[PDB]
Amino acid sequence: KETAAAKFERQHMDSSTSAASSSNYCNQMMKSRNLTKDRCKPVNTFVHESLADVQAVCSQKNVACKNGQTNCYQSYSTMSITDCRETGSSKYPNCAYKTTQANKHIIVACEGNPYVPVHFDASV
Ligand SMILES: [Cl-]
Ligand SMILES: [Cl-]
Ligand SMILES: [Cl-]
């Protein structure tokens, strides 16, 4: 089974580009991070910052998570992110995603020793 920290990395980190370059970014990334294997994951955010910068959020501003847990953290700075969401035309195994690039604060839930991100809660 994948660890929670490793699943967060796979689903949410994309440190190799500064920003989405095209409308096809999400289609490509959702496929290659294996988020369309048996079903189309409906929504997923990628963060275009170093792993170290995202991990550092776990010692930044403690905020409530949407679900009422208290282990969420909001980045002090905005980060380059891309939101991927299925469009009307999406139908497994032919998933189809809208790509929306933005620069926003991220909010992550953190757990463990080391205390690292395990869920992406939201952007602001
Ligand atoms: Cl791990
Ligand atoms: Cl995988
Ligand atoms: Cl997400």
Supply 52's token pair: 């170290």
| Closest CA relative to residue 117, chosen from 68, 66, 47 | 47
Does an H or E element contain 26, and which? helix 25-32
Q: How far, in Å, is the centroid of ligand 1 from the Cα of 4? A: 7
Number of H helices, E strands in the chain: 3, 7
Q: How far, in Å, is the centroid of ligand 1 from the Cα of 9? A: 9
Q: What residues form the annotated binding site for substrate?
A: 7, 10, 41-45, 66, 85
14-44 core/surface letters (b: 16 or more CB in 10 A; e: else) = beeeeebeeeebbbebbeebebbeeebbeeb
CB 48 within 8 A of CB 77: no
Give the number of C-alpha atoms closer than 13 A to the C-alpha of residue 66, restricted to the C-beta side. Answer: 8
CATH code, 1-124: 3.10.130.10
Residue 10: φ, ψ to 5°: -60, -45
Give the number of C-alpha atoms closer than 13 A to the C-alpha of residue 71, restricted to the C-beta side. Answer: 10
- Experimental method, per PDB record: X-ray
Q: Which residues form the catalytic set? A: 12, 119
Going by C-beta distance under 8 Å and a sequence separation of 6 or more, which residues neighbour residue 111? 4, 71, 118
- The answer to whether the bond into 42 is cis (omega within 30° of 0) is no
Query: What is the gyration radius of the CA atoms in the chain, in angstroms?
Result: 14
Q: How far, in Å, is the centroid of ligand 2 from the Cα of 61? A: 31
Per-domain boundaries in the chain: 1-124
